[PDB]
Design a protein around this ligand. Structure first.
Ligand SMILES: [Mg+2]
Lengths: 192, 132, 38, 414, 108, 20, 122, 101
RNA sequence: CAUGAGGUGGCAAGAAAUGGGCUACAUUUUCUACCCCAGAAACGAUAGCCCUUAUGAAAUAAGGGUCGAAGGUGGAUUUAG
């Protein structure tokens, strides 16, 4: 009774302040004569005031492209600029050699724990090692299934230890000791 | 004949809502799903335990909003945020209506272990799409 | 757990905050069986 | 080289208190505690205050089941801390309260840790026996037996008199003990044996001048033991010091007894009962001193004393009377609206019949007057006689001899 | 004592102005903790006491080394590398898995 | 259990037996 | 506006990938319309492509009893989207991706991300 | 408050397979070897036999979650082939459609 | 004080016929190579026992070993496209 905000809202009034969060529909607030439903064979599609699917829409009425701009005037900060690293990544290679991944699988619902969120594969190009003229050759022969030939990239993967922050501490440790067992000369390196 | 989710034509005096007038071969063709969650996309787990909670919340609220629930609910789900939306008839006094929001909000907050927020909507009469 | 789900709904009929139609359907029907039966 | 930039640690959940600043509290709407359809929205204050209470009995009823049987709710799903519940228990069950805990004092005895813990949780005549048994079982033992006894100023200072015999609650039982030299000699005695201690030692002088010209500059709660005496942070002080020319709710009483309120307006950009006195007693100002009235009408109560000063704003300055009718309930509230149009062809005579349509559920006799200005007016004259004149003769001559049958009894019932 | 923490209670009442907008439900909801601690790292909480890639994966420090060339020790290296590839089991239950196996081959 | 339990408008239809 | 920077320089990401995974196609091309306008107001070099969908249909029996010659078959149309960002810092990404995950839609738009930080070794 | 006595025959077989799961993991880690010769591997074979019924995970028969059919079950959504089909036609699982191909 | 509940063991093999399909009865085939320019053979490959393996408290399934049956395109009749 007395349906508000829709005979009483004016234009040249700010909508991004009306729907601050994502919300459900709440048709008495929304001033559009939007319609829903597959109509009957001689009828109009359904109203706005009593629907179900305009509330079953995932509802991108929050965050209009003016709400996007007017949010980020307090969110252009938190943010410090990208270093002028002289890109195409080759001059970001001899600065920044190794490459890693650390994924999250954001689900919804009650809990957070996805056990496929500790997946760490660590990629290193071999042209960034620069201390490998024979201890290149047993790095390659130690890792059987890795080190492609068309691209000289090493991918060591760890999913043996439950936390993501220590799989990274596992990946860095097998990169450092296989490098040293490569620079370890062995007794039977000759008798081939 | 197949009788899966249709109501059957009888006369001219039987009213029916948009949803249950629609047969189940129109589920994403002409209808929406009544509950949204991240379960059935592949390969995601926690599709399984959620739907035996999803069936409670429309069997809970069929009894705690008794005689007044207009059609089925909408059970949105945003991360760790269970969003129930409901359209309900204009038959009860509003002092009762505000009671069972915060009754059911903090009893469904402390069952799912999430926050739960209710958004009611009031319609005077049951909205009828078809006089079948 | 099916006790957790089904006994909480027992007490929420007992405190009368949730009015279910199935167990209403028994205790009215069980009223009219004990008038004759049993 | 390329130098890597700064790990701008982005101040957690304040990441989205940053966004809440951008959204303004919008107009044209109810406050957000309620629901957004018109039926569940309230209309006036009595509905809205009850409704948040009606929401509140949602909580305490739902909570009660959780706390009276928690074994429905021990399925722990991750984790919020969201889950329900002769020496050792004597200090443990002193934390979960009283009378059944403190009764255990002598069956155990048949130390000073729970002699100043379990002997505090009462505040108690019979449990005052164990209060003097405190060091018969320190400083805290003998302290607030009397600071918890300025409520349960007599038997408190008498125990402050009987503690000098052999904290911040030395200065709280004795803080509000005519009496403005012992008051002097109490805060010289504070070095003998705060923003609360000084804030209690003028609460008592408030109810029972020359010490009130002195009590200040020895801060927010150090003003309500001052602002009761007269009757930015610099722009509080440039407001408050120039007021002699828990916190605010008196300052709308001074500014209503006397641009003056716009100094308070800065601290608003910095209770449910007195937070209307905030707003109702502010609207009486901005109405009196028009364009700046019409904006502030839309801003305050959309998101009986407020409509007894509402209408006379329109007196001193014309078409918004049928606008402001529908917010009366959203006789007495129905007559001062009917005062003003009796003091124009289309919009004024309609809503008086809606006051009549209000009335079917100095008042009734002023409905015929504005209506004929711009049949159904006579059936009010039928009830003026069973429950003014010079316009009834006016409307008869223009509307003729059957209306010269109307004016015949106009002098007969005089 | 009680009087220091009760002044943390009645203090909360004087500033508790209502929620008033759509954002401060989300602000309140993790100041308590029912909402998520956005951003999501999928391992929030969940520490295993500073586990760190040598307790989980080198079960040498809990072996209590026997005569190594005996057939029992080769069976313990099988069990050790099995417990190595667990992300499911923690390090307190890995040593407890050995602990039952320790009280068996002293018996047999 | 609870998950057996059902509405009324299915229950009277299964108890009245108004169609063959 | 309170941020309180410290001693410690960046973690520095490169080529953050976002796989938004949905059911309704009309949400995701309205989700990516937000995400290009959530990211090109931070000047972020961005591309979008659509991975092919995996529709995992399964079958079920129709009557409660007999009649294996009568099945009904169900399906999941579950769709995809990539939000291939490139070369952005560790502070900026985790606040850009904040505003993304805070305002991802309802049940539709499951999301998967890859994070590749670069990081000088020892 | 399980829907049959039958489910509560089977709840007992999932909790008594769970507390005795550590034991069945460690004693049956002592058989499937080539090493530790057969006398060391045959007195461990008696102890599993004297460990009871209702403990091994083979005695579970994997049942529907609310109407307790033993078969016709769908593992991903937990429920049998009828009552899952009851909800999918009112549109009550996220993204279940009729397949028309 | 049972037509309910709980425990251990057991029940599913064929004088026979019949329904549905696999394998075949082969030269458009059989074995290897290649998976489509060859070269050899001039049949059919179950079931049955035997040995390991998998999974499992505990043996059904796979693989290998041996045997190499009935089988020569099949009546009235009938099915699908
Ligand atoms: Mg059919």
């Amino acid at each position: 009774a007395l349906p508000p905000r829709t005979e009483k809202m004016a234009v040249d009034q700010d909508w991004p302040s009306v729907y601050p969060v994502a919300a459900p529909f709440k048709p008495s607030a929304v001033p559009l004569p939007v319609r829903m439903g597959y109509p009957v064979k001689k009828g109009v599609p359904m109203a706005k005031e009593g629907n179900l699917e305009l509330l079953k829409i995932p509802n991108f009425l929050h965050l209009t492209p003016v709400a996007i701009k007017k949010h980020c005037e307090a969110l252009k900060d938190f943010c410090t600029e990208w270093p002028a690293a002289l890109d195409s990544d080759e001059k970001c290679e001899k600065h920044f050699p190794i490459e890693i991944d650390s994924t999250d699988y954001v689900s919804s619902g009650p809990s957070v724990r996805n056990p496929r969120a500790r997946v760490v594969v660590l990629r290193v190009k071999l042209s960034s090692l620069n201390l490998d003229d024979h201890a290149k050759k047993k790095l390659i022969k130690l890792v059987g299934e890795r080190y492609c030939k068309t691209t000289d990239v090493l991918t060591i993967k760890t999913d043996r230890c439950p936390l993501r922050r220590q799989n990274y501490d596992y990946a860095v440790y097998l990169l450092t000791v296989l490098y040293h067992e490569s620079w370890n000369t062995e007794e039977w390196e000759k008798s081939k | 004949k197949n009788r899966a989710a249709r109501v059957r034509v009888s006369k001219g005096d039987k009213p029916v809502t948009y949803e249950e007038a629609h047969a189940p071969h129109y589920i994403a063709h002409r209808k929406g799903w009544l509950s949204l969650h991240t379960g059935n996309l592949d390969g995601e787990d926690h599709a399984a335990e959620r739907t035996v909670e999803d069936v409670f919340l429309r069997k809970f609220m069929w009894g705690t909003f008794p005689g007044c629930l207009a059609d089925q609910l909408v059970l949105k789900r945003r991360g760790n945020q269970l969003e129930i939306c409901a359209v309900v008839l204009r038959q009860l006094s509003p002092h009762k209506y505000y009671f069972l929001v915060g009754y059911s909000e903090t009893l469904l907050s402390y069952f799912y272990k999430c926050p739960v927020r209710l958004h009611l909507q009031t319609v005077p009469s049951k909205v009828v799409y078809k006089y079948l | 757990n099916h006790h957790t789900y089904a006994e909480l709904m027992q007490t929420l009929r007992f405190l009368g905050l949730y009015r279910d139609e199935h167990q209403d359907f028994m205790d009215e029907q069980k009223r009219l069986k004990k008038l004759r039966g049993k | 080289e390329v130098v890597i930039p700064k790990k701008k640690t982005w101040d957690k959940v304040a990441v989205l208190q940053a966004l809440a600043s951008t959204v303004n509290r919008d107009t044209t709407a109810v406050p957000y505690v309620f629901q957004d359809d018109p039926y569940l929205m309230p209309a006036s204050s009595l509905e809205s205050r009850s409704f948040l209470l009606a929401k509140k009995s949602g909580e305490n009823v739902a909570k009660f089941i959780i706390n009276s049987y928690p074994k429905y709710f021990q399925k722990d799903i991750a984790i919020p801390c969201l889950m329900p519940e002769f020496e050792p228990q004597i200090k443990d069950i002193s934390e979960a309260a009283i009378e059944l805990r403190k009764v255990k004092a002598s069956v155990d005895m048949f130390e000073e840790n729970d002699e100043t813990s379990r002997r505090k949780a009462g505040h108690t005549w019979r449990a005052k026996n164990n209060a003097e048994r405190i060091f018969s079982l320190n400083e805290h033992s003998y302290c607030t037996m009397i600071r918890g006894m300025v409520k349960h100023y007599e038997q408190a200072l008498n125990l402050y008199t009987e503690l000098l015999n052999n904290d911040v609650y030395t200065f709280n039982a004795l803080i509000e003990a005519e009496k403005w030299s012992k008051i002097l000699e109490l805060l010289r005695h504070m070095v003998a044996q705060n923003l609360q201690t000084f804030n209690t030692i003028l609460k008592c002088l408030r109810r029972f001048a020359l010490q009130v010209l002195r009590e200040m500059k020895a801060s927010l709660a150090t003003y309500h033991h001052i602002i009761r005496l007269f009757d930015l942070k610099r722009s509080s002080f440039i407001i408050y010091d120039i007021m002699n020319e828990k916190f605010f709710q008196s300052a709308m009483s001074i500014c209503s007894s006397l641009e003056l309120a716009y100094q308070v307006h800065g601290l608003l950009k910095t209770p449910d009962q007195h937070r209307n006195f905030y707003y109702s007693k502010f609207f009486d100002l901005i109405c009196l001193m028009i364009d700046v009235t019409l904006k502030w009408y839309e801003d305050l109560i959309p998101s009986s004393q407020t409509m007894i000063h509402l209408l006379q704003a329109l007196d001193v300055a014309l078409e918004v009377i049928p606008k402001i009718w529908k917010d009366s309930k959203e006789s007495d509230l129905r007559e001062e609206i009917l005062m003003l149009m009796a003091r124009l062809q289309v919009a004024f005579a309609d809503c008086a019949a809606d006051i009549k349509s209000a009335y079917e559920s100095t008042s009734l006799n002023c409905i015929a007057i504005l209506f004929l200005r711009a049949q159904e007016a006579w059936k009010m004259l039928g009830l003026f006689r069973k429950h003014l004149l010079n316009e009834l003769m006016d409307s008869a001559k223009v509307s003729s001899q059957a209306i010269e049958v109307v004016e015949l009894a106009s002098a007969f019932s005089l | 004592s009680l009087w220091d923490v009760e002044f943390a209670k009645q203090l909360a009442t004087v500033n508790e102005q209502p929620l008033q907008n759509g954002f401060e439900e989300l602000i309140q909801w993790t100041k308590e903790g029912k909402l998520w601690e956005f951003p999501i790292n999928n391992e929030a909480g969940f520490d295993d006491d500073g586990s760190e890639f040598h307790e989980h994966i080198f079960l040498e420090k809990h072996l209590e080394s026997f005569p190594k060339q005996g057939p029992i020790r080769h069976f313990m290296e099988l069990v050790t590398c099995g417990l190595s590839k667990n992300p499911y089991l923690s390090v307190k239950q890995k040593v407890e898995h050995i602990e039952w196996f320790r009280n068996y081959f002293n018996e047999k | 259990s609870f998950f057996t339990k059902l509405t009324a408008d299915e229950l009277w239809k299964g108890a009245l037996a108004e169609t063959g | 506006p309170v941020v309180t920077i410290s001693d410690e320089p960046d973690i520095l990401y490169k080529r953050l990938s976002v796989l938004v995974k949905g059911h309704d196609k009309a949400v995701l091309d309205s989700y990516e319309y937000f995400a290009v306008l959530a990211a090109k107001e931070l000047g972020i070099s961005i591309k979008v492509h659509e991975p092919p969908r995996k529709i995992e249909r399964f079958t079920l029996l129709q009557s409660v009893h007999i009649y294996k010659k009568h099945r009904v078959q169900y399906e999941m149309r579950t769709l995809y989207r990539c939000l291939e960002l490139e070369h952005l810092t560790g502070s900026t990404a985790d606040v850009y991706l904040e505003y993304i995950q805070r305002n991802l839609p309802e049940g539709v738009a499951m999301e998967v991300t890859k994070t590749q930080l670069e990081q000088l070794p020892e | 408050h399980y829907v049959d006595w039958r489910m509560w025959r089977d709840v007992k077989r999932r909790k008594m397979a769970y507390e005795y799961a550590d034991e069945r993991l460690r004693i049956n880690s002592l058989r499937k070897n080539t090493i530790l010769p057969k006398i060391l591997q045959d007195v461990a074979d008696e102890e599993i036999a004297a460990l009871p019924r209702d403990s091994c995970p083979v005695r579970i028969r994997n049942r529907c979650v609310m109407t307790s059919r033993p078969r016709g079950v769908k593992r991903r959504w937990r429920l049998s082939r009828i009552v899952f089909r009851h909800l999918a036609d009112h549109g009550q699982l996220s993204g279940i459609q009729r397949a028309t191909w």
